[PDB]
Amino acid sequence: KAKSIDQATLQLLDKAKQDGVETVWDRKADMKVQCGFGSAGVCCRNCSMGPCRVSPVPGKGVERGICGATADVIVSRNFARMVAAGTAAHSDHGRSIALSLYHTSKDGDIKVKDENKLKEVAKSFNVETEGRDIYDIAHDVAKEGLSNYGKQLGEVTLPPSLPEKRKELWRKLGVYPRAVDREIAAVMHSTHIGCNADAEAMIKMSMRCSLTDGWMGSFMGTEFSDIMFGTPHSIDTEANLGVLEKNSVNVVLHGHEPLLSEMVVEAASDPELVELAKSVGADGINLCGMCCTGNEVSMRHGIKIAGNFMQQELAVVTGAVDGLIVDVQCIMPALAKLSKSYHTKFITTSPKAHITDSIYMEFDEENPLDSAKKILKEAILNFKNRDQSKVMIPELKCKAILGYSVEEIINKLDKVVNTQIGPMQTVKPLADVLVSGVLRGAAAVVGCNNPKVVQDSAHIETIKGLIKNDVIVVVTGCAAQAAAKYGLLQKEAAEKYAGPGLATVCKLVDIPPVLHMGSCVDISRILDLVGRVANLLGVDMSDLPVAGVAPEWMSEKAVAIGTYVVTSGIDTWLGVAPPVTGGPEVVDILTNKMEDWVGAKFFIETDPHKAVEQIVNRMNEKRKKLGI
Amino acid sequence: KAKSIDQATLQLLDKAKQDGVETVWDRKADMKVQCGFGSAGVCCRNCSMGPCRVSPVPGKGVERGICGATADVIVSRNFARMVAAGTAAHSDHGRSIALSLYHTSKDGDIKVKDENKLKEVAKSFNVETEGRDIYDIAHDVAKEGLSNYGKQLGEVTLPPSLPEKRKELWRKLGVYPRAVDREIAAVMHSTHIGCNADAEAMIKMSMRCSLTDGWMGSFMGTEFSDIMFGTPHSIDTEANLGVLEKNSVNVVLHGHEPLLSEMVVEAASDPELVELAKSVGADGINLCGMCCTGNEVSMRHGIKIAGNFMQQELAVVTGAVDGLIVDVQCIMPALAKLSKSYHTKFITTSPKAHITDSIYMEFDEENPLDSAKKILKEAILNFKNRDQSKVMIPELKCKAILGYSVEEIINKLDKVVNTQIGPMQTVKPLADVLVSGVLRGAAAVVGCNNPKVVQDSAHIETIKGLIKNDVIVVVTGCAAQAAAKYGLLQKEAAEKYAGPGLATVCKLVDIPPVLHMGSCVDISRILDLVGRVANLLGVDMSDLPVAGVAPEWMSEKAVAIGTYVVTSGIDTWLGVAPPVTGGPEVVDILTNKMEDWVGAKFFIETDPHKAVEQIVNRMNEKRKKLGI
Numbered sequence A, B: 001k002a003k004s005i006d007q008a009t010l011q012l013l014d015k016a017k018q019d020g021v022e023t024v025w026d027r028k029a030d031m032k033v034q035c036g037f038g039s040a041g042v043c044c045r046n047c048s049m050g051p052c053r054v055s056p057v058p059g060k061g062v063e064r065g066i067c068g069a070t071a072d073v074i075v076s077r078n079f080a081r082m083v084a085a086g087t088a089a090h091s092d093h094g095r096s097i098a099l100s101l102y103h104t105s106k107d108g109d110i111k112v113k114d115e116n117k118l119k120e121v122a123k124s125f126n127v128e129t130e131g132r133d134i135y136d137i138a139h140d141v142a143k144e145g146l147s148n149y150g151k152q153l154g155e156v157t158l159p160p161s162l163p164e165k166r167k168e169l170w171r172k173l174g175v176y177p178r179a180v181d182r183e184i185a186a187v188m189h190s191t192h193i194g195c196n197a198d199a200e201a202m203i204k205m206s207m208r209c210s211l212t213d214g215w216m217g218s219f220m221g222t223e224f225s226d227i228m229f230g231t232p233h234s235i236d237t238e239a240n241l242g243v244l245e246k247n248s249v250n251v252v253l254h255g256h257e258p259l260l261s262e263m264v265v266e267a268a269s270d271p272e273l274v275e276l277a278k279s280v281g282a283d284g285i286n287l288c289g290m291c292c293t294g295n296e297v298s299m300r301h302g303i304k305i306a307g308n309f310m311q312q313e314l315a316v317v318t319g320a321v322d323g324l325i326v327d328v329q330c331i332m333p334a335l336a337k338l339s340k341s342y343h344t345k346f347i348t349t350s351p352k353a354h355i356t357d358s359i360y361m362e363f364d365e366e367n368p369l370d371s372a373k374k375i376l377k378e379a380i381l382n383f384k385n386r387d388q389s390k391v392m393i394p395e396l397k398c399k400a401i402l403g404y405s406v407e408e409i410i411n412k413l414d415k416v417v418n419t420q421i422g423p424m425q426t427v428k429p430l431a432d433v434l435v436s437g438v439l440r441g442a443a444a445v446v447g448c449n450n451p452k453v454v455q456d457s458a459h460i461e462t463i464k465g466l467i468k469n470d471v472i473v474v475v476t477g478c479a480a481q482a483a484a485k486y487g488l489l490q491k492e493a494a495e496k497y498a499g500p501g502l503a504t505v506c507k508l509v510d511i512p513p514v515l516h517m518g519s520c521v522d523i524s525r526i527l528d529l530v531g532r533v534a535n536l537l538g539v540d541m542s543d544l545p546v547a548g549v550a551p552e553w554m555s556e557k558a559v560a561i562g563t564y565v566v567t568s569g570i571d572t573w574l575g576v577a578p579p580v581t582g583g584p585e586v587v588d589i590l591t592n593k594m595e596d597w598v599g600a601k602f603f604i605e606t607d608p609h610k611a612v613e614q615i616v617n618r619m620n621e622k623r624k625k626l627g628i
């Protein structure tokens, strides 16, 4: 089968074959037929009595592990641990952001750039703002956010966009969230040998844990990032590997933590570093981003996006990356080995993400700007080691428009508001187009790449099908970057791919049919948006014609995201089967019984066209239930 | 191979074969040859690009997972997740204890029974005590303990017995603990795909996480349990399955959390329940304990111990267990199936541990005594369903002495203190016998059973070898219960098994050669004891001739325990190989490089006699280093 639908990706794969280096596709081929027990989730290693593998087919073979655990128990515990790991990644990201907010000052490297957003957040956290210094408010808000992570007494703080009905449903179901780290610890405790051996209770614990990701960790990370670095607005950028410059220093920022990439962007305008780039024979400094850190700097500053997850290696294959600076998460360790075949300096910066044989330059949060400057200086000095005979940058780049935060979307919707009617600054125009049926619904396309799927194929096919069916699409993460590379993040795309209702809406509001809402933590924005719509219509989020899709997901973070999206009341389609087919009870819970608990459920569909059809049918069913 | 060295265990295995019921041994046989990849730890399932298996033999076969992770990376991440799971179990136990302390009242079900212990703990937590109400002090202490779990700013609180040198070494190494749930979340975050791919850093993160178990979670759980339920003192009890009564109601308490078992013990003396037991035709109520909850109620009240981990099923096989009340952890789910073959009521009580097809009666912490009375009444009423023709109780039980908390040990040591010299109430006599060489050292024997080892064989052989070599032995958990069943927890055992120096010490202090220090969380007591000795000698804990042994461990909790014992500076022998042989770098870190970091290291030895020899040699070389 084809490795990708992206032509620049194919050219660089040919180059990697010529250079004798191996990619993620080569390692996937080397893995051959993957273990059936692990693929079905019926393998357990939770204690040293094991490893235990039970039959994925009920009634045949070994039925129980040594402790007596059934296939359903093993599957449910494995699924719960995936959710706990994803929640941990997102919560650690949000915790770093909250600590950075706590360390803001007027004359420091980290300031408050959006005071209005900070005051609204302070209102949401019961922090007084009138007649107060802005940094005192910021510190109080950071304290409340940090308490959300580890409070042992009392209730956590949730955003006002979350409907009261959803909160009450969670409380009745027993999944109402506690402090984030406490829920992660609870999930890890209940999967220990000889604890929870009941699939339904295990799934409910995993949902409870995922809620602390969706509504607390990711939400606080996003809002505090907006406070410190600015709320995203409509902005132009370029996407795909063609953004690399042969005649300039190329600095590629890969990872998820935004403070480092923000400081690197600021350092790139330093006169001394620009002069140094000139002195090593380069035209200038060309910052490019990848994955979620690329999404953040692109949403807030228009930094060009070099590529998504499965392109990271190919960025090095060009031979033009002088410095690849990585913080945490979705950083393929093979990069270190790959960096030996080129001049590239592979720089790790976080104590959480040491990588063997990489150059470690710890990013100092006490002096973020100076630390970013020294890291960037190492990348710039590496330009002298460039071998221009090994350089091949495909001439394939695509224009994209992004920056669609909830605030930006509301500002855009204000155009189609009659002044004599109003109100202004609400999601009411979006609610109106959804209720009238001009738009059939809204769908979130999120997730990673996965060698099991032709890279970017499922993302593009799902998005085109949805917008052709007058479903407005919001995108995050690597799916958003696939849309950017393909050319869907363009106003012109409205008349090229969208159906009649969505084309009319795009023309009236002057937006692309696909709205890039940011990184994987920025999925919280989507929740926020949906919540507002629900609160405007006086219904729960499970009554709306909305859906989420993860066509090509790979990470534990994706599992946690899908779990909290379903738990919030939004049906989720998975384009990659999770390791649960071995447990019939777990499959039945996730795809059938979940609708009785939270009004939504998982859909597993590896065919994107069938997924689009199912999404449209489900949205029409919910519309008929709602009367619209 | 023999299944056990215990004769009562063998008789009940014959009965289980005659009854056509499966045991843990039968399921272990059914599992046959366990997966080599999982056994070596070279299998990874951390993302849905996998499952990935790399060769356990370097230089052959597949070398890297799909993301590029090496065998060392996969092994280190698997080990770190085991540590995180064990830390989560212990920390959740301690968190429940702290919450119970927070709800103590003068006229409530949960009171303060050891005010002196509470005042000393309050001193350790910087809580004022002079001229204050005892329950105000208790609530402040509980607040400080709870803050240890989830504080995001500042430093955690550690017991005064921990040497300053050990803390400084931890700070220099980068493993100084943070809040417990924060460290669990950090480990889970760093094992996520594309985060940490460096074995040394991964092992250091796991050590940092395990420290929050050893010195914060388990320590606080133990000390708060002492405050609420009484400090253990020397007390007699009986052990092994013979403690069951044919003519009495048999109520078996299995699990770890002590509040439920304490309330059940209190409810058993209720006049209405005793009258009800008489009216259903029984002579009375016979409470028996298993595993750690049995250890707690036995340490504090002399409740008879029915058996350790791999005996739980056999307790039901007798046909005499009218009620089996379980809370969390090390509860084989197969019990639910097994109790169908008998009249036994298998009662789950904790929302953390639901077991399918068991009778769920949620233990209400708000009204603990009434809830325990209701559960106990269900067990008593089940006596009418006893089938006395199916009853077979082995006439095999053994006298044991336990209750050796640090306070009790100090009280015993006061006997050999010359009044004209002093001081009293210190560990000085123990330090003196260790320094003079009358005792060669002290060894902690802890851990579970494991079907991979003849049950209780390794525990008994290791303990007998150590005490024969004049090494005083402290025991916890299932190892302590194996010692109890065998008969080592007896004063007479001093003249039957101990060497000359240990026999003299036992005669002078009037103690058994093997000291039962309580449950698995009570391993913190051992740390406390060692710390005091170190603080009395002005040395670090790695300079002492001490060791820990886990001859037959199975649980993730055992992994976390061994990790924090080694990190505290105490060499640890493992009688069951952990899944790390596939990663040569991880093996080298755990067994060789750890000594450079923390002055102690792991020893993997499956032969108990060889383990005793190695322990004696290591203790002698540490003595020669210390000059004693």
Ligand code: SF4
Residues within 6 Å of the ligand: A035, A036, A037, A038, A039, A043, A044, A051, A053, B035, B036, B037, B038, B039, B043, B044, B051, B053
């Ligand atoms: S999933 Fe289990 S059975 Fe399959 S290779 Fe991995 S450890 Fe072995």
Ligand code: SF4
Residues within 6 Å of the ligand: A044, A045, A046, A047, A048, A049, A050, A051, A052, A064, A065, A066, A067, A068, A069, A074, A192, A193, A194
């Ligand atoms: S927890 Fe149970 S099923 Fe899992 S490895 Fe241990 S004995 Fe086997």
Ligand code: SF4
Residues within 6 Å of the ligand: B044, B045, B046, B047, B048, B049, B050, B051, B052, B064, B065, B066, B067, B068, B069, B074, B192, B193, B194
């Ligand atoms: S994390 Fe890497 S090694 Fe583990 S399953 Fe995913 S791709 Fe394979």
